[PDB]
Symmetry: C3
Subunit: 142 residues, 3 copies
């Protein structure tokens, strides 16, 4: 534990089905006001924050070529409750023989106290996580 | 609600042709000394800065296989008027059937007041600033 | 000037064989306590750190399809002197036309004084340091 608000949650291996964020420990972090509610991060005070997140996709051979992987970081203010696209990226893996497609999103944003941030993916069934650090989501107060 | 120099500009949808950075946007930034001139960021004081940027490429089927996507972050010091390769990455999509190839660049650098930073791409025809959060460029003073 | 611990080492072109981190100056960093020993970064004090790294892979035509590129950032505490995956990602280039697959890893972690951090890759044969800004590794104290 230390100064400024901070969070660094990680995927859930046993949650084989969806993308659930957990407060584990190597240093998976979550303190100084920041809390995890409804699988989302909640900022404490007003200020500039650094938001980042990565997800790894994995597949055993392509179906056809109509496959698209997406990762996004939306911001939900308390006034409204809509998921405005802060950081978004897309990937088209296609076109034994496995395939892997990682995605990283990073950026600095001005956040207001009470805000709710989240990181979602469209195809949580390719979501790879057969190892520590292959998918995470975090933020820090600057 | 702020203090250190900071910038987080984004692509321009209507600039269908080139990569133009904009700031007059809700969750976008550009303040505390940092200004956007000639489509480039300009640092205020001397110090360590975090520079990041992402771009998303999109295509509708490959031409052949001789296609290379590149994203770079160069530095230009006032006196020495010359681009310095700070962050660079390359991608080869190729080898009906669309393709999405994102690229993220991040790093911490010591900058001198008056410096001019920029983020460029070689094939602005493959640029895909479709939805929000897809293509951006920012920096922050640590 | 600045005063928190910081490091931003880069690949070694002439080290044609392995991934060697170098710190001369500039446009890379390594100061304020942080040192580079045994090709690894060593933290000075206890606190939250931002760790990032990127590597670029390059190839001249695929062998078959059984090729996997990996980049990882392991930790090593004073107590248990063994690695600890902090950030890991994988990529599969294959599904004489060349190819380019970059990988970026970023995250915030709580580090204890005396810790040793490193960034490794499984196939240092494609590790592409032909240009500047293509392969780097750094950290900063928040």
């Amino acid at each position: 534990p230390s100064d400024m608000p901070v969070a660094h949650v990680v995927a859930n291996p046993q949650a084989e089905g969806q993308l659930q964020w957990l407060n584990r420990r190597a240093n998976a972090l979550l303190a100084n006001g920041v809390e995890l509610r409804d699988n989302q991060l909640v900022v404490p005070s007003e200020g500039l924050y650094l938001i980042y997140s990565q997800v790894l996709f994995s597949g055993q051979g392509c179906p056809s070529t109509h496959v698209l992987l997406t990762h996004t970081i939306s911001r939900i203010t308390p006034a409204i409750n809509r998921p405005v696209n802060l950081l978004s990226a897309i990937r088209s893996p296609c076109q034994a023989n496995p395939w892997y497609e990682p995605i990283y999103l990073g950026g600095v944003f001005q956040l207001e106290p009470g805000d709710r941030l989240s990181a979602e993916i469209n195809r949580p069934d390719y979501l790879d996580f057969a190892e520590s650090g292959q998918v995470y989501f975090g933020i820090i107060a600057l």
